[PDB]
Design a protein around this ligand. Structure first.
Ligand SMILES: [Ca+2]
Ligand SMILES: [Ca+2]
Ligand SMILES: [Zn+2]
Lengths: 313, 327
């Protein structure tokens, strides 16, 4: 009853797409680079944005028409194309072809309104904060418009605190921070502020991995243990105690256990050897799928310890 | 934490006969006009079917002569190869075509000199590669370029140091790689970039312990692997992640038995084929990546597979293209 109508309509759609595709290839072979091609491809690309040859056909048409149309006619075509693209992105926001066509179009305009494109990105990131295509496009727009890293840094903070799904936003921060502090390895005052920010994040949502991955990076981005300032030493010891408190709240949370180990390494590997081994045992019991990783990590750390003990005068 | 739940009745045995039957009959089951919507990737579709059949020892059941004629018809005057007749050339389908011709030891079916010129023409000043003349830059295309050229014995045709510099500029805080500089790490681009670095003899530049950790954390309680944090696991991501781990010498960092069980659960017991996830509709793409994953996990009934080229190792031995891996 209800399934045959669905089978038949989808058969009709396929016949239309095939006919329209046939028409486009025939027009192309005939050298007919005109608006009828734009009409035909619009019927196909909405549902099938990965049909790359059809995006190429649209570009050939737009290039041809630019040569023969008034500047005002050409501007009208560009605006129609921007609207078509946005309607396509709303249906399928994860198509490489659609985002590339938008990049191609914007890159050739006199002309372009980049602030409006940044807003298009903000809108799509509100819908899906993990859409890498949209983040990549945002990076493109920001480079084209010469948006300052500090501005982009303020954007990431708002996205990290307003809700979760933060891996993409933490990633962006990891790229922006070294720009605000560019060396030919973050400065400690910067690092300490980041540690504060990320620690807020993993105490708010201890289950999400993004803050824990970012934190591990931060723990390597600094001075070195033999170089710890009293402030940094004190901050890392405070973090160690806070992770132990989280361990009590969430006994199945493997991220906090791993981080306890990494903090002890950052503070004093030999002094904390006993506790490090104890934590590896607990952690392997809590996260058994990672047991081989954890054994290799422990082996690495024990070899580091041997080398440290052999340095002994 | 987002994960699939495998049901107690999921397949738990390898159904190789059904998979070979499935692929041998693929594209004969519906009317011609129905299949249609995937013509834009046909050359890669052909590669998936042929490669999985060869891994299963059943390549002869496919139509060699028909496919060679098809490939010849898909090479354009610029040297590049398209997905299908009348479609436009692209590095993706140029790779797929050269992979197929390598399987069949029929490389001179196409004009090799012109393929090399096409690939060479797509390299940019920064060492990156565009996919075609329209200029989309992606590390996927760096891999397509060097993999195509390695198979042809012509890696020296491109600017290799600049290509390497570009790929390394895409390395991230977490040890992974994205599309372009500044792009977030993704299993697909990690696979392309680690494959690229294997081909160019640059795996010493990877932080294998850091990247290995990011990769082994893709394994969910179901046993399946996802392609980045907070995604559902699937057979495609599972191959990309497992192959990357193999390239960097850390395959043992995932639970191999749990992954095997996940991949087997994606088989369709009635039709053959694998789907992206348990219960879903099968396709040749996931059939290849499921069989390939099982092979890397040690399945004796399947030929050893290259984690770099996703082709039988015995084929790559024949052309003497076997990049050293980390271990
Ligand atoms: Ca045959
Ligand atoms: Ca599916
Ligand atoms: Zn998939």
């Amino acid at each position: 009853e209800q399934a045959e109508a669905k089978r038949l309509e989808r058969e009709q759609k396929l016949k239309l797409y095939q006919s329209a595709t046939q028409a486009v290839f025939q027009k192309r072979q005939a050298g007919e680079l005109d608006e009828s091609v734009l009409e035909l491809t619009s019927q196909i690309l909405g549902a099938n944005p990965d049909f790359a040859t059809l995006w190429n056909c649209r570009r050939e048409v737009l290039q041809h028409l630019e040569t023969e149309k008034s500047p005002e006619e050409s501007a009208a075509l560009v605006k129609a194309e921007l609207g078509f693209l946005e309607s396509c992105l709303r249906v399928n926001p994860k198509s490489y072809g659609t985002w590339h066509h938008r990049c191609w179009l914007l890159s050739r305009l006199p002309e372009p309104n980049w602030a409006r494109e940044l807003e298009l990105c903000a809108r799509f990131l509100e819908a899906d904060e993990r859409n890498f295509h949209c983040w990549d496009y945002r990076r493109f727009v920001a480079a084209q418009a010469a948006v300052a890293p500090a501005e982009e840094l303020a954007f990431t903070d708002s996205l990290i605190t307003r809700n979760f799904s933060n891996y993409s936003s933490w990633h962006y921060r990891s790229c922006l921070l070294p720009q605000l502090h560019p060396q030919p390895r973050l400065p400690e005052n910067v690092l300490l502020k980041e540690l504060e920010l990320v620690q807020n994040a993993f105490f708010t949502d201890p289950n999400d991995q993004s803050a824990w991955f970012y934190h591990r990076w931060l723990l390597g981005a600094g001075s070195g243990r033999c170089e710890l300032s009293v402030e940094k030493s004190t901050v890392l010891q405070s973090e160690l105690e806070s992770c132990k408190e989280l361990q009590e709240l969430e006994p199945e949370n493997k991220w906090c256990l791993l981080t306890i180990i990494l903090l002890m390494r950052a503070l004093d590997p030999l002094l904390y050897e006993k506790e490090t081994l104890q934590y590896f045992s607990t952690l392997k019991a809590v996260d058994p799928m990672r047991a081989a990783y954890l054994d290799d990590l422990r082996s690495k750390f024990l070899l580091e310890n041997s080398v440290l003990k052999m340095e002994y005068a | 934490q987002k994960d699939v739940t495998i049901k107690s009745d999921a397949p738990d045995t390898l159904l190789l006969e059904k998979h070979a039957d499935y692929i041998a009959s693929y594209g004969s089951k519906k009317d011609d006009y129905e299949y249609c919507m995937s013509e834009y990737l046909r050359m890669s579709g052909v590669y998936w079917g042929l490669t999985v059949m060869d891994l299963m020892g059943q390549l002869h059941r496919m139509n060699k002569e028909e496919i060679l004629v098809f490939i010849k018809s898909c090479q354009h005057e610029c040297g590049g190869v398209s997905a299908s007749i009348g479609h436009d050339p692209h590095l993706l389908y140029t790779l797929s075509a050269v992979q197929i011709l390598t399987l069949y030891d029929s490389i001179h079916v196409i004009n090799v000199d012109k393929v090399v010129a096409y690939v060479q023409s797509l390299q940019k000043e920064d060492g990156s590669f565009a996919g075609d003349i329209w200029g989309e830059i992606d590390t996927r295309f760096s891999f397509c370029a060097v993999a195509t050229l390695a198979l042809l014995g012509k890696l020296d045709a491109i600017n290799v140091e600049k290509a390497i510099e570009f790929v390394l500029s895409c390395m991230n805080f977490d040890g992974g790689f994205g599309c372009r500089p500044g792009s977030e790490s993704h299993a697909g681009q990690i696979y392309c970039c680690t494959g690229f670095l294997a081909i160019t003899s640059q795996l010493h530049q990877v932080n294998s312990d850091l990247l290995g950790w990011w990769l082994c954390e893709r394994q969910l309680p179901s046993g399946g692997l996802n392609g980045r944090p907070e995604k559902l696991p699937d057979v495609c991501y599972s191959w990309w992640v497992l192959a990357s781990l193999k390239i960097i010498g850390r395959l043992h960092w995932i639970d191999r038995e749990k992954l095997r069980s996940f991949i087997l659960a994606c088989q369709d017991e009635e039709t053959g084929g694998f789907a992206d996830r348990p219960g879903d509709m099968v396709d040749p793409f996931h059939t290849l990546f499921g069989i390939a994953g099982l092979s890397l996990l040690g399945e004796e009934q399947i030929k050893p597979v290259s984690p770099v080229f996703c082709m039988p190792e015995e084929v790559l031995q024949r052309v003497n293209v076997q990049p050293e891996l980390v271990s």
